[PDB]
Amino acid sequence: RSYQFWDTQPVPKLGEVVNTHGPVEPDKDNIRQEPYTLPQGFTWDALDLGDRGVLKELYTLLNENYVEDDDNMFRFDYSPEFLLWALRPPGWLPQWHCGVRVVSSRKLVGFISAIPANIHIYDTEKKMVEINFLCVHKKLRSKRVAPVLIREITRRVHLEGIFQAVYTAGVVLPKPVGTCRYWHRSLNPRKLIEVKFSHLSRNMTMQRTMKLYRLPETPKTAGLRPMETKDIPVVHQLLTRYLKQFHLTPVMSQEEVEHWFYPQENIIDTFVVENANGEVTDFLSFYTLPSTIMNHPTHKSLKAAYSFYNVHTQTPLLDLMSDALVLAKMKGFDVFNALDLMENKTFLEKLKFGIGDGNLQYYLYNWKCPSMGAEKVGLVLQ
Ligand SMILES: CCCCCCCCCCCCCC(=O)SCCNC(=O)CCNC(=O)[C@H](O)C(C)(C)COP(=O)(O)OP(=O)(O)OC[C@H]1O[C@@H](n2cnc3c(N)ncnc32)[C@H](O)[C@@H]1OP(=O)(O)O
Numbered sequence: 001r002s003y004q005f006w007d008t009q010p011v012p013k014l015g016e017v018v019n020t021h022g023p024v025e026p027d028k029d030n031i032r033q034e035p036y037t038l039p040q041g042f043t044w045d046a047l048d049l050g051d052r053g054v055l056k057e058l059y060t061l062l063n064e065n066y067v068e069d070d071d072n073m074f075r076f077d078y079s080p081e082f083l084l085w086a087l088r089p090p091g092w093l094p095q096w097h098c099g100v101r102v103v104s105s106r107k108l109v110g111f112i113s114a115i116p117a118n119i120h121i122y123d124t125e126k127k128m129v130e131i132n133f134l135c136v137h138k139k140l141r142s143k144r145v146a147p148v149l150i151r152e153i154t155r156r157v158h159l160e161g162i163f164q165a166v167y168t169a170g171v172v173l174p175k176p177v178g179t180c181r182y183w184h185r186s187l188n189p190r191k192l193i194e195v196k197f198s199h200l201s202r203n204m205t206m207q208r209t210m211k212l213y214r215l216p217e218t219p220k221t222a223g224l225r226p227m228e229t230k231d232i233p234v235v236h237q238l239l240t241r242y243l244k245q246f247h248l249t250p251v252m253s254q255e256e257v258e259h260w261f262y263p264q265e266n267i268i269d270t271f272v273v274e275n276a277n278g279e280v281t282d283f284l285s286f287y288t289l290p291s292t293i294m295n296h297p298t299h300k301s302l303k304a305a306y307s308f309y310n311v312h313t314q315t316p317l318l319d320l321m322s323d324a325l326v327l328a329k330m331k332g333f334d335v336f337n338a339l340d341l342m343e344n345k346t347f348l349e350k351l352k353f354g355i356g357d358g359n360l361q362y363y364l365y366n367w368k369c370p371s372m373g374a375e376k377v378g379l380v381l382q
């Protein structure tokens with residue numbers, strides 16, 4: 001079609017053949033000082049997420065108005081402490097927690113965020129931001145408020161000297177650098193079929209389906225244990241080495257590996273394999289993100305775990321992923337979710353995952369390069 005806003009932006013056109021690598025336009029050496037204008041009656045407010053009352057306003061905005069699945073049955077329900085993990089990693093800036101309030105009532109009705117990240121894209125490493133948590137209240141939809149939040153976070157990032165971004169979305173925009181399908185692995189099929197996340201096969205009874213997805217009570221790989229503070233350097237080494245094989249990846253410092261992987265109950269889990277010699281040789285990780293089961297009288301919340309970064313050097317990836325499913329089931333999850341990026345297609349079908357119904361598209365702002373297969377994408381955003 002045409003894209004009234006995105007056709008104005010430094011991104012390649014949909015259908016554009018890209019053979020080159022580099023910025024769409026130059027670094028700016030004068031940047032707009034004034035904020036963009038919202039519609040009348042709304043104002044900007046930078047949200048101090050260290051204030052418990054303001055963090056709870058953001059939690060309510062997203063709980064009521066954030067991403068739903070393609071059937072409008074489940075809505076993400078990020079916890080307040082999860083939002084602090086995703087929004088205050090090393091190098092976060094207060095002006096990059098960008099809220100929109102109704103002037104009279106003060107109600108929070110919009111948000112968008114940026115966090116810094118060093119990104120490796122083919123043969124270039126650049127300091128970028130990751131854009132996430134763009135949300136407009138349901139009563140304000142389709143009034144072109146989202147382009148104002150996108151231009152305003154772009155301005156605030158340009159003031160800090162950054163001219164590229166990475167972001168994901170379930171919608172097609174000019175122009176995906178990679179396209180990933182999500183898959184799911186049932187852990188509690190009775191509840192998944194009750195809430196109609198899943199359906200009972202015409203060729204399987206409930207008994208048989210419970211048996212098909214049943215898992216061992218403890219993981220198979222010897223020496224698996226939670227990551228501890230003494231493991232931060234070796235997790236950093238393992239991840240850095242492992243990610244070199246992909247074409248779009250983060251470059252994390254040792255402090256960022258501590259932030260993104262050190263376990264926090266009900267937010268992030270990381271388990272390392274420590275061999276007979278005391279050496280850590282592998283790790284698996286997954287984050288906790290429930291979904292509200294919209295308008296349902298009985299079960300209110302779907303407990304979902306999401307595959308994060310999984311690094312294998314001595315344990316087969318298939319066994320590490322089996323370990324992850326066992327652990328998730330022990331921790332009371334209903335479903336484990338994963339995308340088809342990195343080496344994930346080597347295990348999805350073998351471990352009984354089923355393919356979902358939509359795409360998570362990956363995008364770069366102000367960076368032209370060839371698109372890549374899902375197997376070459378090595379970056380996961382919450
Ligand atoms: C150098 C620094 C650069 C930094 C910035 C880099 C770019 C960052 C970009 C943002 C990365 C976000 C990453 C995440 O957080 S992905 C998660 C996005 N959030 C949700 O899906 C939550 C539920 N939905 C909503 O809250 C609203 O429907 C949103 C806010 C998504 C759109 O609000 P609304 O439905 O009321 O629409 P509008 O009338 O105001 O605006 C319509 C225009 O908006 C374009 N649109 C729709 N959805 C998206 C989307 N997910 N990314 C980018 N553009 C989007 C659309 O094609 C149209 O443009 P054009 O077709 O006319 O051209």
Ligand SMILES: Cc1nn(C)c(C)c1CCOc1cc(F)ccc1-c1ccc2n[nH]c(CN(C)C)c2c1
Nearest residue numbers: 067068069074075076170182291337338339381382
């Ligand atoms: C369950 C369920 N609850 N909901 C609300 C959806 C979209 C599902 C389907 C599974 O979706 C997934 C399953 C995966 F294994 C990985 C990712 C997603 C997914 C899909 C669309 C998204 N849009 N914004 C984000 C947030 N962030 C990455 C920018 C999304 C995350």
Ligand SMILES: [Mg+2]
Nearest residue numbers: 142143144145
């Ligand atoms: Mg709008």
